[PDB]
Structure 1
Amino acid sequence: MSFPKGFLWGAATASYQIEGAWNEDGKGESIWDRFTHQKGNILYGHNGDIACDHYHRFEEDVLLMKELGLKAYRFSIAWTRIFPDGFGNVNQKGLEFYDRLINKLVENGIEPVITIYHWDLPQKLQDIGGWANSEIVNYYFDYAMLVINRYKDRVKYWITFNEPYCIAFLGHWHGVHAPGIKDFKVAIDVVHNIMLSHFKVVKAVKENNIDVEVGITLNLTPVYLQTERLGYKVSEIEREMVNLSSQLDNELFLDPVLKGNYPQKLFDYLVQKDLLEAQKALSMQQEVKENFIFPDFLGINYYTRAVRLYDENSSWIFPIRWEHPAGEYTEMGWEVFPQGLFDLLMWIKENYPQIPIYITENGAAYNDIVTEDGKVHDSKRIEYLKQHFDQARKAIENGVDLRGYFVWSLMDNLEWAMGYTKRFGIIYVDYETQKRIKKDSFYFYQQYIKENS
């Protein structure tokens, strides 16, 4: 089986993780500027003030993409470069920068794929509630249509949101991401405002006849039962509670994006447990059904699975615990489990309406060292990628409409609250000299593209 003719072999980045220049050219403060400037949020006190300095070095970075042979490149636009206050006046230097990057990409025959919101909310919008405030829907819509209408001639693929689960729960429940809020009820409100924001943009693109594909990116985690790994008999309560726990990861976002409702089992449980007010639950259901519209594609960030079992003494919002199967793990503590990419893709094809799928993020963090002859022999990353590439091809053979694959990441970068301690790039970045050093995985990916395109 071959990959289909125009398969988008890509790599992926996000603005706050690579761009630096956090306050040049009138760029507004984002919630991640504020978050990394507070003590105790980021390992070793790292921040994204400089990052990979991609704001200044983007030309050389695009030439490495041309050397790599990428068919596409996924990046995000920093909202605070365009609207320093979230609302208000447009900033010309911000538009100028993305104008130059997008044109350099088109110039070198690389399809741009743009994530509109990749977590860097204007701090001025946080100051009036951020994503917990329903007016955010319109502030996001005005920003999203400005960049779609400006770039639609050069950019055919648009992603409204990257990983809503994180924006909501890690940003507003666990408090481990910006804005650092800790309130499950605010987190659900965030989930809702994101869905409405996503719907309003998709509808605007269809109604105005704008010839672009618009999608959304969800991080999905196939959940497996420890009991079934052990060959025990699965009780019905255990299956019920593990499925509730996996609806919080996956169906809570797939269901409204692809079917126009939230998952009913989860909502009942959350209401029963006083985690979610019953009126909001009915209101959210009503508002999503009214505003729902199908997207043009689904983006899937896949890294690993979860193995879970039932436990009535758990401190989690569901009575479950996590188990740790034997095998290979990364610097993230994530099981290397390529079969989960295939199972997930088959599970998507069989449970939701037909839709084109792109793997918009997949990759692995290993503790890379530069050798004496300036190489980086990341054979563990090569093995990770090779095995997941193979599951993707296998899924295509089984009828999954998989149209692209974007490796995370093109270059080492700031890994949010882990700082720069986790390297995901196929390109090593020396953060003291900003030198880019192609890892061995760069040449493997280069060869894999050449022979599957």
Structure 2
Amino acid sequence: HLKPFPPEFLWGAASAAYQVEGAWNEDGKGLSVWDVFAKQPGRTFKGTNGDVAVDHYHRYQEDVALMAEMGLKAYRFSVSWSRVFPDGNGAVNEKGLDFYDRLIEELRNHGIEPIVTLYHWDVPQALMDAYGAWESRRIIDDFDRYAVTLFQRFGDRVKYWVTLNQQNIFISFGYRLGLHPPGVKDMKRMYEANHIANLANAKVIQSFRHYVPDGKIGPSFAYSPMYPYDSRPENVLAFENAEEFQNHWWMDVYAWGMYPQAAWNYLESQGLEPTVAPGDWELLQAAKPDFMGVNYYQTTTVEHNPPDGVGTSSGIPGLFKTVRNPHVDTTNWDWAIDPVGLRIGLRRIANRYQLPILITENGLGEFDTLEPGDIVNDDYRIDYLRRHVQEIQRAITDGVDVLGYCAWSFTDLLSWLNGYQKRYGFVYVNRDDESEKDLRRIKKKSFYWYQRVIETNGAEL
């Protein structure tokens, strides 16, 4: 017998500021590190950038009306720090706050719960210029001041808050892979930045207990649960290594305030462990969240990787390497499609940390065709979303406390580096990589599917 979705289950959809808003230099907004990075020649596909994106800044009333048509219970968005503090620190921009106040009012006039994301990768460029943003302890207090501003303005009306969204991605892409700002490839720097981000998350949760005492807050982690390839002992050991180094390295700090030891000793053997200050442990341990946010797309299977092995497959010599999983389907971009992996991840979080879970992001990106009569038949997206939602209900039945599900994304949006054509939305936006066209919003088949899921609280999938 499956348990129903609970009565206040947050059936949601989500976006990120840079990906949807546009209005990059309007109303006193300052430059973000992504405004500057995306304009560097060659960094983004076809030079696409967030100057306009899908123009949600100007079109938010129409987008919220579509959310109310769907009957969304929640909408998760991020606040652009550069709209609120153009220089990161210094003077507050009231026009920037007023946008978010208007959005929040629009949502709440339509019965939709705002879920505010403090940070989605868009630190103001002035903090990078002054002190290298996330590589300086200065950002702890600067981020805290920005979060407290939002808690004071909006805490009366927003219950659910996410802090750092996918820290593991903005830190590893920014400092290890060099794919995101600041374009660094230096693992020592990455781990230092990562440690400062940890401190900044904990500081803001501490502040939130003061200013929003009836609210709920947590970080959101980009979680790819690890699988061993098989029951070969060395492959299971590779999975122990991978799960700790890729996943526990973040989530243990969020839940328990401590880094896992094996991974710490591995980094210390490489001279990569972060610099720890007095007070750091006590801060990290005293900032327990209300939930773990999870951004989920796929699992990762791993196998043994010898000390001269792989650094197709990626890994850490002597720790693990990735291997294709022969037992799941793949998307056209070679991501696994693994809905049972979402149940697995959910079970692992409850079993390890006993935390409730907000699923902050899950979705399917695909080329969608706009057919005559403004029809998009994205049954491939319905099938993927269906399967995941089915597995969530199984995890709830097992005993996981799932607070809600935010499908990625509400409208189509700009990808960070790959332009617009791999689409994620319930709502098609008429534009492409060459121009904004008319930016018209067109409901996809999946829109109506999810409207029906919500209406029936997930009895009709």
Q: Same fold (TM over 0.5)?
A: yes
Match of 2:434 in 1: none
Match of 1:45 in 2: 47
Residue 318 of structure 2 corresponds to residue 324 of structure 1: no
| CA-CA distance at 1:208 after TM superposition | 4.6
Matches within 5 A, 1:294-443: 294-312=288-306, 313-315=309-311, 316-319=315-318, 320-326=320-326, 327-352=328-353, 354-431=354-431, 432-443=437-448
Match of 2:230 in 1: 227
Preserved CA contact (<8 Å) 1:299 1:358: yes
What code does the residue aligned with 2:403 have?
R
Match of 1:71 in 2: 73
| CA-CA distance at 1:435 after TM superposition | 0.6
Specify every segment of 5 or more residues in structure 2 that has no aligned partner in the other structure, as ranges. Answer: 432-436
**1:22 equivalent among 18, 21, 24:** 24
Q: Distance in 2 between matches of 1:324 and 1:371?
A: 35
Preserved CA contact (<8 Å) 1:360 1:405: yes
What code does the residue aligned with 2:58 have?
H
Q: Distance in 2 between matches of 1:424 and 1:99?
A: 26
1:175-208 CA distance string (max 9 Å, x none): 1112212211111112111111111111122245
**2:139 equivalent among 114, 136, 154:** 136
Match of 2:179 in 1: 176
TM-score (norm 2): 0.93
Match of 2:165 in 1: 162
Residue 242 of structure 2 corresponds to residue 248 of structure 1: no
What code does the residue aligned with 1:403 have?
L
2:92 partner SS = coil
Match of 1:288 in 2: 281
| CA-CA distance at 1:381 after TM superposition | 0.6
Preserved CA contact (<8 Å) 1:331 1:365: no
| CA-CA distance at 1:225 after TM superposition | 1.3
1:403 partner SS = strand
2:419 partner SS = helix
Preserved CA contact (<8 Å) 2:305 2:316: no
Q: Distance in 2 between matches of 1:116 and 1:146?
A: 11
Match of 1:55 in 2: 57
Query: Does 415-424 or 374-383 show the bigger shift?
Result: 415-424
Q: Distance in 2 between matches of 1:314 and 1:285?
A: 37
Preserved CA contact (<8 Å) 1:140 1:197: yes
Residue 215 of structure 2 corresponds to residue 216 of structure 1: no
1:24 partner SS = coil
Q: Distance in 2 between matches of 1:303 and 1:341?
A: 8
CA spacing shift, 1:370–1:209, aligned 2, 3 Å:
closer
What code does the residue aligned with 1:344 have?
G
1:109-143 CA distance string (max 9 Å, x none): 10000000110010000112110111100000000
Q: Distance in 2 between matches of 1:285 and 1:407?
A: 40
Match of 2:453 in 1: 448
What code does the residue aligned with 1:347 have?
R
CA spacing shift, 1:387–1:426, aligned 2, 3 Å:
same
The number of aligned residues is: 442
Preserved CA contact (<8 Å) 2:349 2:355: no
1:217 partner SS = strand
Preserved CA contact (<8 Å) 2:350 2:356: no
Preserved CA contact (<8 Å) 2:228 2:238: no
| CA-CA distance at 1:227 after TM superposition | 2.8
2:301 partner SS = strand
What code does the residue aligned with 2:50 have?
G
1:417 partner SS = coil
1:10-29 CA distance string (max 9 Å, x none): 00000000000111111100
Preserved CA contact (<8 Å) 1:332 1:422: no
| CA-CA distance at 1:386 after TM superposition | 0.4
1:201-234 CA distance string (max 9 Å, x none): 1112224563221111111111111234xxxx32
What code does the residue aligned with 1:263 have?
P
Preserved CA contact (<8 Å) 1:44 1:419: yes
CA spacing shift, 1:328–1:372, aligned 2, 3 Å:
farther
Q: Distance in 2 between matches of 1:78 and 1:452?
A: 32
1:418 partner SS = coil
**Aligned-pair Cα RMSD in Å:** 1.6
Query: Does 268-277 or 123-132 show the bigger shift?
Result: 268-277
